[PDB]
Design an enzyme around this catalytic site. Structure first.
Site, PDB file in Angstrom:
ATOM      1  N   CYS A 217       7.763  23.274 -15.403  1.00 15.59           N
ATOM      2  CA  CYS A 217       8.873  24.187 -15.371  1.00 15.59           C
ATOM      3  C   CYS A 217       9.906  23.671 -16.378  1.00 15.59           C
ATOM      4  O   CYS A 217      10.726  22.797 -16.051  1.00 15.59           O
ATOM      5  CB  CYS A 217       9.464  24.321 -13.990  1.00 15.59           C
ATOM      6  SG  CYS A 217      10.852  25.481 -13.949  1.00 15.59           S
TER       7      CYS A 217
ATOM      8  N   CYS B  11      13.647  24.108 -15.218  1.00 16.39           N
ATOM      9  CA  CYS B  11      14.152  23.519 -13.992  1.00 16.39           C
ATOM     10  C   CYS B  11      13.118  22.625 -13.292  1.00 16.39           C
ATOM     11  O   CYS B  11      13.061  21.422 -13.593  1.00 16.39           O
ATOM     12  CB  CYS B  11      14.756  24.551 -13.039  1.00 16.39           C
ATOM     13  SG  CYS B  11      13.761  25.887 -12.602  1.00 16.39           S
ATOM     14  N   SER B  12      12.353  23.141 -12.350  1.00 19.22           N
ATOM     15  CA  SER B  12      11.519  22.258 -11.531  1.00 19.22           C
ATOM     16  C   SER B  12      10.477  22.993 -10.723  1.00 19.22           C
ATOM     17  O   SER B  12       9.804  22.388  -9.845  1.00 19.22           O
ATOM     18  CB  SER B  12      12.414  21.450 -10.614  1.00 19.22           C
ATOM     19  OG  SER B  12      13.219  22.307  -9.814  1.00 19.22           O
ATOM     20  N   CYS B  13      10.361  24.289 -10.946  1.00 23.14           N
ATOM     21  CA  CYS B  13       9.537  25.148 -10.152  1.00 23.14           C
ATOM     22  C   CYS B  13       8.150  24.604  -9.891  1.00 23.14           C
ATOM     23  O   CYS B  13       7.396  24.267 -10.829  1.00 23.14           O
ATOM     24  CB  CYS B  13       9.515  26.501 -10.865  1.00 23.14           C
ATOM     25  SG  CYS B  13      11.205  26.958 -11.134  1.00 23.14           S
TER      26      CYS B  13
HETATM   27 CO   LIG Z   1      11.902  25.064 -11.915  1.00 22.43          CO
END
Ligand SMILES: [Co+3]
Ligand SMILES: [Cl-]
Ligand SMILES: [Cl-]
Ligand SMILES: [Co+3]
Lengths: 202, 227, 227, 202
Positions: A107, A110-112
């Site tokens: 991601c 972000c961090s998905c």
């Molecule tokens: Co993310």
């Protein structure tokens, strides 16, 4: 603090801690949250979820050709039938590593990450180095994990810019003849389901 | 927004800090656990945020120096604070004062309250999730296999279109269906769903590089145009 | 390098801190003055850096979190340290130890030395400067008025081609002459001068925006191609 | 410091200070620098140079049409003849503000500024907000300086990606009839020579 340069001065982590407590206190006082609601969440993410769920899906795919076929044809239906569904796991896709195709998930924004299937993401997955670099020099990033792919292997990086999530289905290694599904599941690493490692022979 | 969060293609962030899975501790401070509880607890009730779109923009709006130093759950604290104030759930002055209280007296007691109905509600949210898939009356503009132009757009508000993919040619890999549109939804401007596509980009096109690498990115219809 | 330094077109850095000129103090700490003396003193003698190219890459290589927090003369300290170690003028271990000495005992005495010949040499450098203009045997590839393509290149080492201008059409405004080529010179790979051009880009092309704005950027010949 | 997250932790400004002293000490001990060489530089940039030089060039342009013509035709020759030349001032160009064209100078990549003519740059000129924003939303940036241009005025932003430097030649304001060249020079602000301000009537 020179008022020309407030942007040089980060909030200390003690600020975030205090801010967290302030939010917690105000929201509980106002009736928006409760102690037990907060604890319920912590229990779920720290303890109830984890990569073992994905590991079970991988081992089943390795041991049951019909299941692997259904999974690859319609992963979202199959995963939901198994109960691996929830917040940040509403739409989960599965991509198979093959001899000449290697898959890596990221991601960048972000961090998905598919919590219901894999639990919380790795520390490094959320940090800028991996996020910045893996879309541009995945071979260099993979080498830092100990995976040195030949030039002839194609790499596909799957950047999670929407709520669609992906799990990597890694190849069953050598040396596993006669192992049970449960024993194979213990071989499946979190990292292998992100694409940053192959699975070692036992 | 062309922010510090949009790191894809950046150089200089250094080596990836490899750690063995079993040693990769989830939480090292209680406030990090609390951050998770705050986010999920609020979201489950639609407080400050209903989906992840509003959540993301609050993080993207952080001061760059904070984004890079707060640690990951620091982002979560920042966006909960941002969104609860922005929507009028919390007052900024009251929040700042209370922050100061916990800064000067970290052992200040946290008020206790049991709300089993709220627990059930939160639990339901964790298990049911919240799909952004919608149906719309229009047909998809693009087809699998089509070579498209990923537009050179520069929204100042929220977008899911990474800068590294802008002004590039790519190939449609899948038509997912219509999804809630982040560039609107993050700003509380309606779901206004659009077709979402998966698009394959080649390394040669993204970077001018010569290896067998490609990136599959999910792009909303309005991010693209025909060639 | 696509680094934190390359900020053109980024959102989120906030308001410009306006200050009246007379109140805009140059230096607030003695180490900032010292940073200037170190940079100019070294450069005048070709120590660590001969032109500004090597100077810039040392700054660009900073950790992003340092770049954003060190303050401006912090960049200068970082690049002097980087370049003096990189070229073998200083040993990293010795530099780190001495740093530790001044960290633990800030009032440690600085050794004194007068070198009037060196003063004259430094003065000459301040007044004479160091032009990067060269002559080459080739003719310019591009002409004033020509519509060119600013290439989509992504060097991992130093470049003067801002990311916001890549993969764009622009118009040649001037042919300056051949200048020392930064993408090579910063890495001590030769002057290898190339024609330098001024190129006008329209807001519509850079951003998709509708106002009467344009950006004039100086681009080396190899950054561009004909249409 | 959690070794997963060293990048969250900036060097304190005390580090840079110590590093500066360490460099100074080692270089003097090794015979590379001297106390008087370092002081000579500090004197030059803190005291000898400044925006007054550019101010004199502007006032001369306003009062001497032939000079203004030569300056605009061949600024590098003219400025060198006046002695406004040196490190970071080897190639200086001049662009005239007109009723329908407004010029703004920036170094998006760093801080490039013509020291020999203008002295050291403004605090804000070197910082990310101005650098990031002025190439994309110059009208918004200018408004933060109190300059609210009409839509009909074209803005030209000059990003200093090479060693070529630019000074803005601002327009002579109303209310200056009968003023001497020396008196007009006192009106010329540093900010006006960067393009972030017009000159106010006296
Ligand atoms: Co993310
Ligand atoms: Cl594999
Ligand atoms: Cl003006
Ligand atoms: Co500069």
């Amino acid at each position: 603090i020179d008022p020309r340069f407030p942007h040089h001065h980060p909030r200390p982590q003690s600020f975030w801690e205090a801010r967290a407590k302030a939010l917690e206190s105000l929201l509980i006082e106002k009736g928006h949250l409760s102690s037990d609601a907060i604890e319920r969440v912590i229990k779920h993410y720290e303890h109830e979820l984890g990569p073992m769920n994905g590991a079970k899906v991988v081992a089943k795919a390795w041991t049951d050709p019909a299941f692997k076929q259904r999974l690859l044809e319609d992963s979202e239906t199959v995963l939901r039938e198994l109960g691996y569904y929830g917040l940040q796991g509403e739409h989960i896709r599965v991509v198979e590593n093959t001899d000449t195709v290697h898959n890596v998930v990221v991601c960048t924004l972000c961090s998905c990450y598919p919590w219901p299937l894999l639990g919380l993401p790795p520390s490094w997955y959320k940090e800028p180095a991996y996020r910045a670099r893996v879309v541009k020099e995945p071979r260099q990033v993979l080498k830092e994990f100990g995976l040195d792919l030949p030039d002839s292997v194609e790499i596909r990086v799957w950047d999670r810019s929407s709520e669609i999530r992906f799990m990597v289905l890694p190849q069953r290694p050598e040396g596993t003849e006669g192992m049970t599904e449960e024993e194979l599941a213990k071989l499946v690493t979190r990292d292998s389901m992100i694409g940053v490692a192959k699975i070692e022979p036992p | 927004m062309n922010g510090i969060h949009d790191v894809g293609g950046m150089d200089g962030f250094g080596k990836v800090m490899y750690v063995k899975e079993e040693e990769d501790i989830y939480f090292t401070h209680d406030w990090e656990r609390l951050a998770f509880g705050l986010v999920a607890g609020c979201k489950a009730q639609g407080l400050g945020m209903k989906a992840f779109d509003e959540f993301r923009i609050g993080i993207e709006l952080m001061r760059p120096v904070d984004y890079l130093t707060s640690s990951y759950y620091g982002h979560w604290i920042a966006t909960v604070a941002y969104n609860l104030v922005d929507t009028g759930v919390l007052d900024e002055k009251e929040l700042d004062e209370r922050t100061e209280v916990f800064l000067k007296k970290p052992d200040t007691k946290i008020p206790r309250r049991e709300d089993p109905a709220l627990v059930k509600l939160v639990e339901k949210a964790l298990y049911d999730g919240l799909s952004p898939l919608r149906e719309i009356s229009a047909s998809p503009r693009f087809k699998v296999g089509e070579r498209i132009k990923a537009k050179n757009i520069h929204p100042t508000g929220h977008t899911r279109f990474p800068r590294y993919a802008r002004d590039k040619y790519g190939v449609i890999d899948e038509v997912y269906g219509a999804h809630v549109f982040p560039d609107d939804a993050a700003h509380r401007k309606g779901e206004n769903p659009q077709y979402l596509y998966r698009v394959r980009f080649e390394a040669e096109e993204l970077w001018g590089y010569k290896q067998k690498d490609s990136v599959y990115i999910d792009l909303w219809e309005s991010y693209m145009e025909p060639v």
